[PDB]
Design a protein around this ligand. Structure first.
Ligand code: SF4
Ligand SMILES: [Zn+2]
Ligand SMILES: [Zn+2]
Lengths: 444, 434, 419
């Protein structure tokens, strides 16, 4: 009936909207489970092998986490940029001397270009704070919680003025091997919740994805959370007749049974908006018991965020709408000159961390010790996945190609999902050789 | 946990909840304070002492002979509770001495509990070697042991067990030439055995407590254990239980007779000072007001009582209303709790705000000199001998036990049947006497 | 060792922050009562001049040679006339004014919705002529507009208020956050005096003021013989209750106890809906009761991880989330108060307390161990406590127990304590 009637009357059913890569035919498919398919989690002591431990925060060790991250980034940028020596933030020198510290907003609202402060690590500047001025600075891009290396002139001590800023070099790409070149071309499914409309429990988009997968026979499928979102009106009013874990297990078993014939590998990325699971970013994977041996060999669960490798190609998965969070308070000298998405991806690749923003927006919950020990990019990923409420896009910056799969369901309006070829190119020749071939953003 | 007594030299490494953590801490603090007070009041060897402390153990489930129940819960409770007291008590030399006294009392009582059959396997579990001699060896060397023995009268070598010990373990014992030596091995009766083991145990505890005192600064960084571990013994009541919210029928006119028949000396003299002065300083005023709140007096009764008494105070009744009635209603009502919502406990009365000139609050036993204690006792008509042991107890700084003895003397009874810590408990027991 | 000085009377507040009557012994055993004190300084200039006068009166009375009771009586009477004068409006209007400078332009402040002075700057720059520039000092007063807006969202100019008869001033907002903090900062440490008590002294605040009142400084282990471990009714008295609308009749259901009633009819609250007309037992809707429990404990966890910080100098009360890298001895220094110490709005152990309060609400097994009379226990358990309803209650327990098990050092490991 009227629930998902748009999905029963969507003209764009199966139509592809945007593309990146090379002009490719429409018969997108895979070899099924047959063939050598690699799948390994990577980096930052193995992204929550166990479940999780605590919700007890200590302000001192949160501080040591902050200052340790600042010191690490400062040392790396000092060695990369051949900087002479940093100076304390409260020590006034007339000659332009470099400084260091993470960016923060002076007040508690949304960041404004003239409402920014600089606070450095304790071994340089006792962890103190100082307001910054950007009128003199020509170009910039700032958001709270990023490290910066500001060679601004501070002749007074109580306030600096920006002269010129240093961009942060990203991590080196993960160096491949011969067995990585021993892989043939593969394509991946990506999909993010919600999987039902704002007034349904039927999960018609979920059935549609089941049909798409068992018709297309892909290599590996990605399903992001939330699966049973808390922000849904039907759950916030809490008229459901079944337990949250019961509904969630029902959903997972529906996807599992719907992809038995697919043969494609499967993994689910939990999200903060998921209700039954722990709302602590970074998150442990889901919990499930009823699996056969082939099910375990075919389906996985990964922590959020996760750095996993497929056929020697690095996949950087983050479920949280970091693009939307950054877009709210990230600022730049010019807006229309470049792409806001491009600069936000620039920051996420630069800051070496799955979540470079500090303090986070209200609708998150970050435990900082676990964030520091589990949510750092081991390498600049080959390809990134950032399901965001903003418009779907696919861009490539600093070698790293990013795909925004879009939201599979926007209330009752049509959603999108994405397909991407990957294949390790020639081992030598051009210095940069991205495994990815081409991507399609195709409406559901 | 292989045996009931155990020597505490292997810290536990388990995981327990905060509620269990506090329950163990408070329970063992209560046990040690009870041991202190009972040992002060009675002689350490009497059957009354033994049975009373056994009942204390049973109500606090800290030790018992091995069975299905004993293996899991009680001995583990003993272990973690003792180590958390180590953390609490290693702060100061005075606290260490106090803890050592009470734990020696506890361990000697527990050893007296253990039957003679199991002491052999207890010493074997103790990991330090001691060999009991055979009956034939005892009979053969009885004459040598008696000849070389201390002033123990007669040749009677009774059923007391005799052990074989390396000579270096009993240095102070043999260095007086009061024991027989055979190839560097000694032979000793049970009393000296337990003396030796308690001296060794006190040495090990002294070293361990010093080491933990070296380890305090690292372990105090936690915020959920600092405010407890600072004050398990110093300023914690052992479940005084005379909390606000009690019930009873009190007639306002009867307050004088109730003061002269059922008030602990501090509160009795405070009430007399109120009657003879119609005015109190802040400390005494608040103390007596919240005591009257605790005893069961209702809000209107308390307000009318204080207003009537300030009628003889010669200030304006509306001034009384505006100034004080707010304070009395606040004490009877909303938050500000743990300072105005509660009836004062005795340990607090003794440790907080000593009275000055013009003040009459504070426990008199601790806050007034012995001559004025004697004058007050004469004014209250207690026998001179009773006053004598009252002053002896005051010299022993056991003020609560002195108040106890005053209670039995004024009630013409032998034992009150408890250990007082709260003036409201004092009053409740006095009413229980009717 | 040696003597360094004599204080005839001293107000101990904090390290190098106190009030103390300096005594310098002169000849013939006499002395001069020199007036010196540390830490009395104030950081923000957004207080009323009458509030400053009241603060000076408080410091003068607390620094007089007379007795504690005399000082308390004088301060309580004076506070009472101040409260009555403000309530009945006899105080001249000009003393209600508040001054404040502008670091930036009004639109530049990210918290424009929350700052009343930038709100007044917005209003003046919109309606009038001369704009408010940075570096200029705005003059303004609060108002009561009957629009149920936040006080900050109602601040007006003094001339505008005097030209407006439709809307009046907010004596409640003053007695809440313009007079009470200034007096309480000094008069609160005096024993037997609490901010609730000052609220009763000054006006009709007590209930709504304990609702809008900070209970962080109240806690202190300086109780020299007070608590041992408390009981439930005072442990959970600060914990928010449990809410649920009834699916049958849409009626709100209140739960802060396993049982409900008085004596013989002490039946559990889940037996009957709070609505007298509702005839369906909440015992059927265990699924969505558990769902609501998951939802609100999720909200509480989110609120705690929000990491809201408050300055504990009562005058400042700066509300921020960015934990400063600067760190003093006790904790994180206040970025607004260069001499202070932050601590969370919602304590981690406060959330632990509230979750334990939930498990207490649903722990019928333990609640069955608190009513002494075993005959009543038996008849009540046979009349209502069936194994099925006990299993439902146990499910309600586990709904929060499966958070408590992983919850934030609600369990303590002994190895790192005894290492
Ligand atoms: S021991 Fe306690 S109850 Fe007895 S007089 Fe002293 S303070 Fe009062
Ligand atoms: Zn109902
Ligand atoms: Zn402050």
């Amino acid at each position: 009936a009227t629930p998902s009637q748009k999905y029963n009357s969507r003209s764009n059913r199966g139509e592809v909207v945007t593309s990146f890569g090379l002009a490719q035919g429409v018969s997108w498919s895979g070899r099924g489970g047959a063939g050598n398919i690699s799948l390994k989690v990577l980096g930052c002591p193995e992204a929550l092998t166990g479940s999780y431990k605590s919700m007890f925060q200590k302000l001192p060790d949160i501080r040591e986490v902050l200052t340790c991250k600042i010191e690490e980034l400062g040392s790396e940028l000092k060695e990369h940029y051949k900087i002479e020596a940093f100076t304390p933030l409260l020590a006034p020198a007339q000659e332009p001397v470099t400084l260091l510290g993470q960016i923060g907003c002076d007040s508690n609202g949304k960041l404004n270009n003239k409402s920014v402060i600089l606070e450095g690590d304790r071994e340089h500047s006792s962890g103190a704070q100082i307001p910054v001025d950007l009128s003199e600075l020509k170009e910039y891009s700032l958001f709270p919680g990023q490290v910066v290396i500001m060679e601004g002139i501070n002749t007074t001590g109580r306030k600096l003025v920006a002269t010129k800023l240093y961009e942060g070099v990203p991590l080196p790409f993960y160096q491949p091997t011969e067995e990585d070149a021993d892989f043939e071309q593969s394509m991946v499914l990506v999909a993010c919740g919600p999987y039902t409309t704002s007034d349904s429990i039927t999960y018609d988009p979920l059935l549609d994805l089941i049909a798409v997968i068992n018709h297309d026979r892909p290599d590996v499928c990605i399903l992001f959370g939330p699966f049973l979102d808390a922000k849904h009106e039907q759950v916030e009013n809490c008229l459901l007749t079944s337990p949250f874990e019961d509904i969630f297990k029902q959903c997972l078993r529906t996807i599992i049974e719907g992809t038995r014939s697919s043969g494609s590998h499967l993994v689910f990325v939990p999200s903060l908006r998921d209700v039954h699971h722990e709302p602590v970013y970074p998150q442990p994977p889901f919990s499930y018991s009823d699996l056969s041996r082939e099910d375990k060999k075919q389906v996985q669960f990964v922590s959020e965020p996760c750095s996993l490798s497929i056929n020697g190609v690095i996949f950087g998965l983050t479920s949280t709408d970091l693009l939307f969070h950054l877009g709210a308070e990230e600022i730049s000298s010019s807006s229309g000159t470049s792409d806001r998405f491009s600069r936000i991806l620039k920051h996420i690749l630069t800051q070496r961390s799955y979540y470079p923003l500090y303090p986070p927006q209200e609708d998150m919950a970050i435990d900082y010790e676990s964030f520091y020990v589990y949510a750092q990019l081991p390498v600049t990923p080959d390809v990134l996945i950032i399901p965001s409420e903003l418009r779907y896009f696919v861009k490539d910056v600093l070698g790293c190609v990013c795909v925004n799969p879009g939201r599979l369901t926007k209330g009752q309006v049509g959603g999108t999902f994405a397909r991407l070829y990957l294949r390790r190119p020639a081992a030598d020749g051009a210095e940069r050789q991205s495994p990815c071939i081409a991507v399609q953003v195709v409406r559901i | 946990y292989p045996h009931c007594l155990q020597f505490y030299l292997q810290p536990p490494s388990e995981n327990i909840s905060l509620i269990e953590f506090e329950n163990l801490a408070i329970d063992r603090v209560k046990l040690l304070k009870s041991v202190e007070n009972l040992g002060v009041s009675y002689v350490k060897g009497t059957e009354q002492y033994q049975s009373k402390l056994e009942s204390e153990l049973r109500k606090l489930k800290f030790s018992y002979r091995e069975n299905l129940e004993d293996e899991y819960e009680p001995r583990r409770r003993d272990h973690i509770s003792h180590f958390i007291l180590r953390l609490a008590y290693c702060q100061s030399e005075e606290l260490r001495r106090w803890f050592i006294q009470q734990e020696m009392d506890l361990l000697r009582f527990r050893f007296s509990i253990l039957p003679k059959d199991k002491i052999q396997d207890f010493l074997k579990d103790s990991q330090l070697q001691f060999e009991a001699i055979s009956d034939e060896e005892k009979t053969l060397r009885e004459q040598e042991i008696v000849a070389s023995s201390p002033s123990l009268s007669g040749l009677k070598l009774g059923f007391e067990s005799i052990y074989k010990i390396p000579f270096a373990d009993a240095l102070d014992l043999f260095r007086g030439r009061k024991v027989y030596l055979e190839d560097g091995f000694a032979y000793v009766p049970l009393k000296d055995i337990v003396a030796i083991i308690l001296n060794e145990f006190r040495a090990k505890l002294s070293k361990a407590l010093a080491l933990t005192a070296r380890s305090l600064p690292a372990v105090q960084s936690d915020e959920r254990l600092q405010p407890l571990l600072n004050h398990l013994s110093h300023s914690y009541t052992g479940q005084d239980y005379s909390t606000q919210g009690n019930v009873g029928k009190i007639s306002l006119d009867q307050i004088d007779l109730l003061s002269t028949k059922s008030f602990p000396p501090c509160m009795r003299q405070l009430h007399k000072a109120l009657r003879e002065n119609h005015h109190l300083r802040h400390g005494g005023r608040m103390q007596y007001g919240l005591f009257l709140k605790g005893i069961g007096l209702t809000l209107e009764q308390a307000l009318q009582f204080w207003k009537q008494e300030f009628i003889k105070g010669k200030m304006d009744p509306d001034k009384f209303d505006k100034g004080y009635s707010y304070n009395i209603r606040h004490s009877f009502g909303k938050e500000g709790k743990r300072t105005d919502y509660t009836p004062f406990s005795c340990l607090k009365i003794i440790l907080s705000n000593p009275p000055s000139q013009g003040d009459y609050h504070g426990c008199p036993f601790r806050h007034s000199d012995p001559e004025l204690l004697k004058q007050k006792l004469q004014s209250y008509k207690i026998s001179p001998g009773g006053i004598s042991q009252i002053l002896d107890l005051v010299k022993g700084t056991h003020y609560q036990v002195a108040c106890q003895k005053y209670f039995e003397m004024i009630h013409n009874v032998d034992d009150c049947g408890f250990s007082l810590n709260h003036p409201n408990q004092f009053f409740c027991e006095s009413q229980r006497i009717l | 060792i040696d003597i360094d000085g004599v204080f005839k009377s001293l107000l101990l507040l904090k390290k190098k922050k106190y009030a103390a009557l300096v005594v310098e012994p002169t000849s013939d055993g006499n002395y001069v009562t020199k007036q010196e004190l540390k830490g009395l300084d104030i950081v923000r200039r957004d207080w009323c001049d009458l509030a400053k006068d009241t603060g000076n009166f408080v410091i003068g009375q607390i620094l007089s040679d007379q007795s504690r009771d005399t000082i308390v009586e004088n301060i309580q009477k004076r506070l009472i006339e101040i409260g009555e004068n403000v309530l009945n409006g006899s105080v001249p209007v000009s003393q209600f004014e508040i001054n404040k400078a502008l670091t930036k332009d009004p639109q530049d402040y990210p918290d424009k919705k929350s700052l009343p002075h930038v709100h007044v700057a917005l209003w003046i720059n919109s309606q009038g002529g001369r704009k408010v520039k940075a570096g200029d000092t705005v003059s303004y007063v609060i108002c009561q507009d009957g629009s149920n807006l936040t006080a900050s969202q109602r601040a007006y100019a003094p001339e505008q208020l005097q030209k407006q008869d439709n809307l009046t001033i907010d004596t409640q907002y003053y007695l809440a956050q313009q007079i009470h903090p200034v007096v309480a900062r000094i008069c609160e440490p005096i024993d037997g005096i609490d901010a609730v008590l000052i609220a009763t002294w000054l006006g009709l605040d007590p209930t709504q003021f304990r609702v809008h009142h900070y209970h962080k400084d109240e806690e202190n282990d300086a109780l020299l013989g007070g608590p041992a471990q408390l009981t439930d009714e005072e442990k959970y008295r600060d914990c928010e209750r449990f809410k649920c609308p009834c699916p049958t009749c849409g009626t709100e259901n209140i739960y802060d106890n396993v049982f409900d009633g008085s004596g013989t009819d002490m039946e559990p609250s889940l037996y009957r809906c709070s609505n007298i007309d509702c005839k369906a037992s909440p015992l059927t809707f265990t699924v969505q009761l558990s769902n609501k429990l998951i939802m609100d404990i999720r909200r509480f966890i989110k609120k705690y991880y929000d990491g809201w910080l408050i300055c504990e100098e009562p005058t400042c009360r700066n509300r921020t989330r960015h934990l400063p890298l600067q760190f003093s001895r006790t904790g994180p220094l206040c970025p607004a108060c260069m001499k202070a110490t932050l601590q969370p709005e919602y304590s981690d152990k406060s959330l632990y307390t509230q979750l334990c309060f939930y498990r207490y609400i649903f722990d019928a097994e333990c609640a069955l161990e608190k009513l002494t009379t075993d005959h009543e226990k038996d008849k009540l358990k046979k009349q209502f406590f069936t194994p099925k309803v006990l299993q439902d209650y146990r499910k309600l327990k586990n709904t929060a127990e499966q958070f408590l098990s992983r919850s934030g050092y609600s369990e303590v490991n002994l190895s790192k304590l005894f290492a």
